[PDB]
Amino acid sequence: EGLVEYIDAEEEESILIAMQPEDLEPAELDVDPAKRIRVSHHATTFTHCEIHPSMILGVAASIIPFPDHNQSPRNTYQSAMGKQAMGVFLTNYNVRMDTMANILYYPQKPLGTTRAMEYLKFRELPAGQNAIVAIACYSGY
Amino acid sequence: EKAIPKDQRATTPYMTKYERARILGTRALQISMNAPVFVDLEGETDPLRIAMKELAEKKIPLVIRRYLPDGSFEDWSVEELIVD
Amino acid sequence: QNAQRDAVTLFCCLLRSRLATRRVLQEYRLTKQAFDWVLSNIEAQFLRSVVHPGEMVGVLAAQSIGEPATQMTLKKVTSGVPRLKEILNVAKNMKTPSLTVY
Amino acid sequence: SNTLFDDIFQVSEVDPGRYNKVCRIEAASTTQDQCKLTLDINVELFPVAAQDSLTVTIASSLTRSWRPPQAGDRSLADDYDYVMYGTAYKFEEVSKDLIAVYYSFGGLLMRLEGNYRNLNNLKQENAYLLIRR
Amino acid sequence: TLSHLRRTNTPIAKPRQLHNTHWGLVCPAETPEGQACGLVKNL
Amino acid sequence: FDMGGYFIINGSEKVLIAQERSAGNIVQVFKKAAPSPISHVAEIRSALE
Amino acid sequence: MNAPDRFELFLLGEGESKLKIDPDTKAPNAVVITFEKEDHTLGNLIRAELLNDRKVLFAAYKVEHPFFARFKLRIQTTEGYDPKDALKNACNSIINKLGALKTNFETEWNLQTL
Amino acid sequence: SEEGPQVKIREASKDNVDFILSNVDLAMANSLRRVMIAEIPTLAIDSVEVETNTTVLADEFIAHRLGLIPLQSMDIEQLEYSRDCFCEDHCDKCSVVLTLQAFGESESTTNVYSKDLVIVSNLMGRNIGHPIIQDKEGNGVLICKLRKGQELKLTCVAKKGIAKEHAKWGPAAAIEFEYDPWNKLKHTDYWYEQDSAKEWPQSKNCEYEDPPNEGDPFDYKAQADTFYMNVESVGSIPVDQVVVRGIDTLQKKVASILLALTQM
Amino acid sequence: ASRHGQKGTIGITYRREDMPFTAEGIVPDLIINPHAIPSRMTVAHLIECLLSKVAALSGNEGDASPFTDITVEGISKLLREHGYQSRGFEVMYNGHTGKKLMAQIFFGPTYYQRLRHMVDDKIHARARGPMQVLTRQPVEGRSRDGGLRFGEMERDCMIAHGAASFLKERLMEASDAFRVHICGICGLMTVIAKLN
Amino acid sequence: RGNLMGKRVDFSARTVISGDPNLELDQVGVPKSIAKTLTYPEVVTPYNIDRLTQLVRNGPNEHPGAKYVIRDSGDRIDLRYSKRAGDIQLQYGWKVERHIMDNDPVLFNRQPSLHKMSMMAHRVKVIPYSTFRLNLSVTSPYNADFDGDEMNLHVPQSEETRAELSQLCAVPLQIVSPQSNKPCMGIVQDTLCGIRKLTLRDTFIELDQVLNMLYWVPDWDGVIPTPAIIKPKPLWSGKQILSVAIPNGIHLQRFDEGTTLLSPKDNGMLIIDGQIIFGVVEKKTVGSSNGGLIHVVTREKGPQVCAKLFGNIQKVVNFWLLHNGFSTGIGDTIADGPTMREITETIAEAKKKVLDVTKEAQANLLTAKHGMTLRESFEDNVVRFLNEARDKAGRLAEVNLKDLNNVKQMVMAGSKGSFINIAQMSACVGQQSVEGKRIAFGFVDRTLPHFSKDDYSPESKGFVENSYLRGLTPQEFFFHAMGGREGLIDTAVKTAETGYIQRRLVKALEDIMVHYDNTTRNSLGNVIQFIYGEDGMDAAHIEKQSLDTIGGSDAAFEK
Amino acid sequence: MIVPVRCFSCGKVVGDKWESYLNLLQEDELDEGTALSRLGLKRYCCRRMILTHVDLIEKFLRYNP
Amino acid sequence: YDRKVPSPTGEYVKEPEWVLETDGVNLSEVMTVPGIDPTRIYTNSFIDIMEVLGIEAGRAALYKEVYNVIASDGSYVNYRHMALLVDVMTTQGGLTSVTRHGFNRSNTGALMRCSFEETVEILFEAGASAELDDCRGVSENVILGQMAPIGTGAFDVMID
RNA sequence: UCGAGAGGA
Ligand SMILES: [Mg+2]
Ligand SMILES: [Zn+2]
Ligand SMILES: [Zn+2]
Ligand SMILES: [Zn+2]
């Protein structure tokens, strides 16, 4: 229909994209101080608009909640730990015969979920538990 | 052949950690092999503590042979050698 | 004998400085018994502070410099691990050859 | 083994130095004008307001381990509302015929001016601070 | 499994460092750390 | 939930990792080294599509 | 593979009697008791009841390591007053309080209706 | 009534019991709530023999699940520990045997609820081994799901124990415990971003204790002796016996001391 | 570990009574030190507690998607409407003593992942046994029940102490000690020997 | 280099390691499974035979026990299965390979063994579970963490070997380090964060707490210190109770900032005869700091006293903290409401500064500073301007942090914190950097394709105005990813060079030993130094002592 | 892969409350908060056992063997 | 550069001075230039100082650059260690580096040098030249597994 | 035995 295009690495040199599709609305204060400071764009010759920025992250980085609030090397560290977590790797774990296959007894869908999670079935096939965690200074163990 | 005379010697009379540890190890090793004990041990049953207590009363009859860089040596009896 | 006198020269500078007659009797009013105890104490402590012959001093020094190098990690001067590599294998050409004029 | 010092003060300023239950107080002996005192007072146990006239004393008694109180059997030389035990740590020769004495009451500090007590206030671990109505 | 099926491998002036041109084509921070950090990347 | 995309050689599921290469049939200009007789180069890697 | 059985937390081993009593070497009228197979559930009650006896000078317990469940209790008291008598006082007074508690509660429960 | 600790029951049910426990030294309350959770004994599955299992799940998975089902243990005192008795492996005087059999005949999935467990040993007239059922429909706990053509057959031997050995022998769930609602003892230092009163909400327990007077200074000889507790039960034992047997196990715990002291 | 690089093994496991209990009786499934929070700057974990708490109580789902204008102030407004302290803190009582903890504890639900490194599949200790034929040294790897490495890195440390006898032990008796005849005149291993 | 200077050795082990505060310093938490597997050959003697025969009877599948017996003939007696497994009578002169038992010396390890004190002797304390438990204050000399770390443990086989572990390889001996002439280990983390909380004047301890706290100290005199306050309540100060851990005869003097002898802030340190006169205790006082408490005790009292002292401090402080409690929320990183307005408008003032400098450069009116090109000068001005922005914003936040806030407390004692972390989590994370410069143009003349070309603004060159708490925008996140990736490249890159550097140093000077005349030399004999260290004294044998003759006016020196 | 009998944190048997949860949603058209509240899971420790539960067992049954 | 210096009284006080920092090194022709202090001047390169002022001067320069590397990270290591390494480089006579060819060719045995780079070449030339090994070095004895004269092995032990 | 890849500090 013509409402979407496939931009390769070289072609986006010649085009001006945009973060939100409400960057194309008119201008003319009262605001919430906790929200992130967003650079007023000052640009108006747009060609494309981003589908949604969250898509820059891969699958393993899609899992992280609030990576925008988090140290970058921490997200790198997580990305290599999340492929290490135990869980239900396949629904047919019983039928298959493979050399190693640890499986979580009681997987739970995480209470804090990326919206991108929905398309990798993390809530459908998770690999962690909603532990009640208390950061605390207890016995020093 | 040549030796370093007892009268003129210029090495630290105080025994270093390394000779104390070696000497204690030698003593404990031979003590383990049913060797005679030269102190009235106060119920001590460990060759390490046995050797330490022999040393403390200077009942250990061994001599060091500190070798100098020229090939020459200096003998230092355990009596001579001090411990702080 | 000269090398001995040399080897304690700064220690003797400190030593004479602290044991000034006025200071020995005014800043801290030492008595004879206490002064003799102090004099013997220092001899024992110093003679305990001698290098025990047999120490593997080179290996110790190498590790002593090398361990903090592992900790090294982050006015445009060349410093850090690259500077250390320059220093170590006598780089003929240096990334920052500089000079400070007095 | 008797009282080493007694005087009467009026507090000048109460300093809650970022402390929830502790205050820092400065007060000069009203009778002897040239003698002042600086000391840390727990305010939760003994409330100390500004411009309060308080009696102040120091004793040497009235090692051996502590014995918890039993009725008035172990009668204690005080009819006070606040007391402390500390240990002298410095004595300052400020100037001729004037002296200053420092105490650290297990953390809480003290400072005492004036030469009037030619006697007592020895360089001694034993020290009691006693405050009255 | 997914993140294995979305991987690359650059066999070998500054390849490891992340680039302005990687925005949206390669995940910014997901990569092994150590032997091959940034040489091996995920989509 | 299996998404596919793997082969089964000798019974072991196998994945071909996408190899990364510099593109072919493009022109690049490279400033050469300081102690080098030639100042610049422009290289083309020619391979038949 | 390594964990000791859970039953060691409340079951005495071979020739491990319940309490071992040792006189404190340094202090006077002082004793250390190595309760076996018990912990803060029980020991804290004993110590806190020792504090109430006004002729009891010292009462304190400590757990060497939470792996094991053997905690020491040490006592000191007035002259001519073996701490075991203060300990007996404490335990028996505790028991009286607990029985009174249970009976009062039963009365309230039977008063209650639901 | 009787001199000592005074208890006022506020609200009551077989599942929940909330009361005020007056005039008790705090250490007693911690220790009682501690032993209320653990040392109090109760019967639950400790052994399982799985004959035929065609389920999706693994047997040890099902055996774990079986352990945590709550079985009636009101008369557990009449029963004895296996470890104590003299039988070869187990007997009717210490162990109660249960049998579980299910087969998938329906096109739809056949469940395996708690009620389908059956009791095989000689009861000998004790209130022992009944799988507790609080589910409104009556089915109770759900152990496994079975397709058409799947069967599961096993035998479970329940034994006496306590929560200190394993958490299935735990008669209580979560016990509320809070004292000095207004922090009048200064027994917790509030973390306040602006105003401690506005940021932290008052608990219901503040309703009963008198509000503080700021003009009055900190009372220092006051100590904690009034507590607000709420005990919950899994149904294995009614709440009243949970707390009563907690007290009784605590006083037995103490009594062994007296005997052992005598032996010295 | 969690989803934010907060790795770490278990130090000790406590029964529920030993655990510090909140007023409602809830007991932490897990306890971690607060000292890993500042140095690593993992505020995402630290916010996940709040979002997961409000989603657990409210009965919805936590929206932790990146580049969303969701704010801690609003999340905490909802949490306050659920009767808890807005920034996640909770009054906590010590389990051993029942005396209230002076510092109210940041406590709530935080998704955690079980990692693939379990000790007993890494535990290994060896006294004697298998040796390579070529080197007459223990075969490499615990899978083959082999011995560990006394590296040149370790040899340096032993050198630095001057511990010559321990060092001889490690490099001969405790690994591949051997006795060989030699002829002095050639000064080599030419010699032929029959010892019986 | 791999089969001759670094052989694979027997009598070795390896585990996930954990830290245990009720373990003392030279103890190690070897598990039974390892202890049953490892052995020591011990020759039978009259002193040992009576225990050793019982051990041989006990067997190898439970502990204590023994797996092997060696005889006059020289042929093994495998005790795992043998008909005479239970009727042994050991003649004198027979070796018995018994399991390692408590208070045995074993050489610990953690690769990479950079320095000599990353491999030191330990006393066995056989414990149940499958982890090498070890003391907390041992993490600094191994650079360990309980996050999946693995540590080896070699076992001696002769009496001289055992001695050398005890006599020169022991942990107390390495408490003072030749390198950086000062202590190695120090109080860390929960103990260090707790000492600060305990020592505060405002912290006052009750009687019931004091008796247990007193008992917990292992070597305790049995003398209950008289309370600080004797009046409305007998109360104890945290300093007073802590003092019991410190032995008699230890004096310490330290002065911080405005430390009058009547200290106002309770800062600095004056400690008399093992009593704490005044000062809050923290890392400067009890860390690995030069001139610290550990530094005093190790040479004044001895190694053994201070090795015991580590455990004693730990046991008191862990208990008090355990019942005081501590935890870090994210209310601990929310700066004051008005302060946030001030912070963001501060950033705005710096933003305007960058704009106006930019326009001035756009008019080609930039005073070209000496040396730098015009574009370089623009760079430096802007980079430093934005760095001012982030540092001033952080210190506007740090100033604005109340005392209850945990993160300050962690920073305050030096347990685990620094200023900049507060800045990046509560003010503004800062400016990213690649190869020194800001985020350069990857796309031709623009950083990202959401920016117009030739844009040198702060937002488009890598500045991250938003804070970790507030949340980074998509472009900020990508720029941050660039910076973090470069940092990780460096991290991976630095180490290998550092390992090679350490290897080259060690192999260059490995022959260097002081001879029996203080002539530092090598195998050739050619002198390197005529007296080691240009004073003939070793490195732990050192202290920062001021010489009062160097400084001062000539009259003041005269007087 | 199946409803856990009890909540790990506290211990209230949530296992008998699963099938009722789904009935609450599908026929009474209730939001999940009120769905768990009807069941009486007052404390969130047990509450997140059912909200965050993924009943994988259905996929496992469908394989005929 | 702010710099403290003796005041006429004798007390030390700051005496700030203007000092120029360059970008290239040609020490040989810069110190001679007038208007400057030609005894104080200092370069960042020890090799040029070695060429001009002498090896003893080059030693202090070498040390000071190692020191600056260390102290720039807010660190400190005792003088003896660094000075011993610096002395090892200087004592050979030139500026012998810590590298495969800078120092490993020497008189220091064969196995000693063959335990670190050019293993087979070190041994090849050693056999070609009939190199003598004292086996006093640690590495030679480590290869041979005997007790190396290290610390405990430095002294022989005999009876009375 | 040999090379290969994937991992943990
Ligand atoms: Mg690690
Ligand atoms: Zn039976
Ligand atoms: Zn021959
Ligand atoms: Zn629950």
Contacts of B49 (CB under 8 A, 6+ apart): none
Show the tokens assigned to H114.
């708690």
| H234 and H255 fall within a common domain | yes
Q: The domain containing residue H31 runs over which residues?
A: 1-41+168-264
Tokens linked to C65:
């410099």
Chain I interface test: which of H162, H175, H177, H204 (most I C-beta within 10 Å): H177
Chain I residues within an 8 Å CB radius of K31: 59-60
Angle between helices J419-426 and J374-398 (to 10 degrees): 90
Return binding residues of J for Mg(2+): 145, 147, 149
Q: Write out the two tokens for B13.
A: 């009379």
Task: Name which of D62, D98, D60 is nearest D77 in CA terms.
Answer: D62
Split into its structural domains, chain H has a count of 2
DSSP codes joined into one string, H126-180: -SEEEEP---TTS---EEEEE-TT-EEEEEEEEEEE-TTT-GGG--BS--EEEE-
Closest residue in H to I85 (Cα–Cα): H200
Indicate the SS3 state at residue I95: coil
**Cα L32 from Cα I138, distance rounded (Å):** 67
Domain end (from H147, H167, H187)? H167
Check C53 against B11: CB less than 8 A apart.
yes
CATH of the domain at K49: 1.10.10.60
Residue ending a domain, among H167, H197, H230, is H167
Q: Answer whether I15 touches J (CB < 8 Å).
A: no
Checking each nucleotide's C1' against the CA of A83, the nearest proves to be M7
| Residue I157 assigned to a binding site | no
Q: Are residues H107 and H174 in the same domain?
A: no
Task: Say if CB H119 and CB H126 are below 8 A apart.
Answer: no
Return all residues near H131 (Cβ < 8 A) that are at least 6 apart. H69, H70, H71, H72, H114, H115, H117, H140, H141
Where exactly are the structural domains of chain B? 1-84
User: Would the Cβ of E9 be found within 7 angstroms of any atom in strand M?
Assistant: yes
Residue of A105, H141, A123 whose CA lies nearest to K18: H141
Which two three-digit tokens encode residue J166?
Answer: 């005890």
Query: Do the Cβ atoms of J531 and C3 come closer than 8 Å?
Result: yes
Residues 6+ apart with CB under 8 A from I175: I137, I138, I147, I150, J7, J8, J9, J10
Give the number of beta-carbon pairs within 8 Å between C and L.
118
C-alpha–C-alpha distance, residues J521 and J511, integer Å: 8
Q: Which domain holds residue K5?
A: 1-65
CB distance from J477 to chain E under 8 Å? yes
- H198 and H144 in one domain? no
By Cβ distance, the residue of J190, J344, J477 closest to A140 is J190
**Interface contact C60-I156, CB threshold 8 A:** no
K32 annotated ligand binder: no
Name every chain L residue with its beta carbon within 8 A of the beta carbon of C72: 69, 73
Determine whether the interchain pair J224/G65 forms a contact, defined as Cβ–Cβ distance below 8 Å: no
H189 and H214 part of one domain? yes
Alpha carbons F49 and J92: distance in angstroms, whole number:
86
Distance in Å, residue C49 CA to nucleotide M8 C1': 43
Residue A81 CB contacts under 8 Å (≥ 6 apart), including other chains: I1, I5, I7, I113, I115
Cα H257 to averaged position of ligand 2 atoms, centre (Å): 28
CB I59 within 8 A of CB I53: no
Backbone torsions φ then ψ of J310, nearest 5 degrees: -55, -55
CA dist J278 and J263 (Å) reads: 8
Find the distance separating the first CA and the last CA of chain F, reported in whole Å: 37
Return the residue of A nearest to J481 by Cα: A72
Q: Note whether G84 contacts H261, CB cutoff 8 Å.
A: yes
In contact, D120 and D45? CB cutoff 8 Å:
no
The annotation status of K29 as a binding-site residue, yes or no, is no
Same domain, H188 and H253: yes
Sign of CA dihedral H252, H254, H260, H261: negative
Chains J+L touching (3+ CB pairs under 8 Å): yes
d(CA J388, CA I125): 55
Question: Can you count the helices (H) and strands (E) in chain B?
Answer: 2, 2
3-state secondary structure of J285: helix
Same domain, H159 and H64: yes
Which residues in chain F touch residue A124, judged by CB atoms under 8 angstroms apart? 1
The residue from H118, H144, H167 where one domain ends is H167
Is H258 in contact with G92 (CB distance < 8 Å)? yes
Residue G51 is which amino acid? Answer: L
Which domains does chain D carry?
Answer: 1-133 (2.40.50.140)
Chain F hits for A125, Cβ within 8 Å: 1
Say which CATH superfamily domain B1-84 falls into. RNA polymerase subunit, RPB6/omega (3.90.940.10)
* Sequence-separated contacts (24+) of H62-66 with Cβ below 8 Å: H62/H143, H62/H144, H62/H152, H62/H154, H64/A105, H65/H143, H65/H144, H65/K2, H65/K5, H66/H100, H66/H143, H66/H154, H66/H156
The answer to whether the CB atoms of B25 and J48 lie below 8 A apart is no
Q: Which of I26, I49, I90 to mutate: most K Cβ within 10 Å?
A: I26
H7 beta partners: H21
Domain residues for G85? 1-114
Q: What's the one-letter identity of residue A38?
A: R
What 3 state SS string does chain L have? CCCEEECCCCCEEECCCCCEECCCCCHHHHCCCCCCCCCCCEECCHHHHHHHCCHHHHHHHHHHHHHHHHHCCCCCCCHHHHHHHHHHHHHCCCCCCCCCCCCCCCCCCCHHHHCCCCHHHHHHHHHHCCCCCCCCCHHHHHHHCCCCCCCHHHEEEEEC
Give the pairing of strands J236-237 and J204-205.
antiparallel
Same domain, H227 and H129: no
User: Domain total for chain K?
Assistant: 1
Task: Write out chain A residues lying below 8 Å of F2, CB-based.
Answer: 90
Same-domain status, H53 and H153: yes
Please report which residue ranges of J31-189 form alpha helices under DSSP H: 32-37, 46-58, 139-142, 159-167
Phi, psi for residue H8 in degrees, rounded to 5: -120, 115
J149 touches strand M (CB under 7 A): yes
Q: Does J516 touch chain L (CB under 8 A)?
A: yes
Q: How far is the CA of H192 from the centre of ligand 2 (A)?
A: 59
| Same domain? H113 vs H124 | yes
How far, in Å, CA of A73 to CA of J482, rounded?
Answer: 10
Query: Yes or no: is domain I131-196 CATH 3.90.1800.10?
Result: yes
Determine the distance from the C-alpha atom of residue J515 to the mean position of all C-alpha atoms in its chain, rounded to a whole number: 34
Interface check for F16 against chain E (CB to CB < 8 A): the answer is no
How far apart, in whole angstroms, are the C-alpha atoms of residue J294 and residue J187? Answer: 9
Measured CA to C1', the nucleotide nearest A77 is M8
The answer to whether strand M lies under 7 Å from the CB of residue E40 is yes
Tally of domains in chain G: 1
- Nucleotides of chain M within 7 Å of a protein C-beta? 1, 6-9
Q: How far apart are the CA of K37 and the nearest CA of chain H, in angstroms?
A: 15
Distance A131 CA to ligand 4 centre (A): 11
Indicate which technique resolved this structure: X-ray
* DSSP state string for A20-69: -TTTTS-------TTSPP-------------S-GGGGS-HHHHSSS-GGG
Please say whether the dihedral angle defined by the alpha carbons of residues J84, J90, J94 and J98, taken in this order, is positive or negative.
positive
- The whole-angstrom separation of Cα J313 and Cα J315 is 6
Q: How far is CA J425 from the centre of its chain?
A: 24
- C38 in helix, strand or coil? helix
**CA-CA distances (angstroms) from residue J90 to B31, J38, J86?**
18, 21, 12
For residue A103, give the H/E element and its range. none
